[PDB]
Amino acid sequence: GAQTTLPSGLQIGTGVRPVATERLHSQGNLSQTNNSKDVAIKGQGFFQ
Amino acid sequence: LLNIFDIAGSALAAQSKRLNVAASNLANADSVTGPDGQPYRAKQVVFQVDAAPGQATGGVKVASV
Numbered sequence: 679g680a681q682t683t684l685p686s687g688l689q690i691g692t693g694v695r696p697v698a699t700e701r702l703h704s705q706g707n708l709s710q711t712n713n714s715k716d717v718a719i720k721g722q723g724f725f726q
Numbered sequence: 727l728l729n730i731f732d733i734a735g736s737a738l739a740a741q742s743k744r745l746n747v748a749a750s751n752l753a754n755a756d757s758v759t760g761p762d763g764q765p766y767r768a769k770q771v772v773f774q775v776d777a778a779p780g781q782a783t784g785g786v787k788v789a790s791v
Contacts, residue, residue: 683762
């Protein structure tokens with residue numbers, strides 16, 4: 679209403695929904711496997 | 727026995743008023759404010775004898791809240 683007192687007014691919510699789950703693109707650690715076929719990436723890049 | 731009808735009707739009105747006061751109080755157990763911003767102060771009815779022309783015995787009237 680038009681305004682001491684407390685601002686009257688019933689405002690009711692609905693709930694909670696999940697919008698989107700995001701992945702954290704942070705550089706992981708490197709482990710040593712002597713296999714020469716394995717390579718690790720230092721930076722933001724993806725093999726196609 | 728029509729005075730008995732007056733007595734019973736007045737007493738029914740008084741007890742209904744007390745019940746309404748009690749219900750309003752129970753509704754407002756947790757109320758924090760009113761329209762003006764003052765706290766809700768609990769109400770109590772006052773019973774008084776309605777024997778104005780009937781000596782010391784008569785119905786019950788609610789004097790005030």
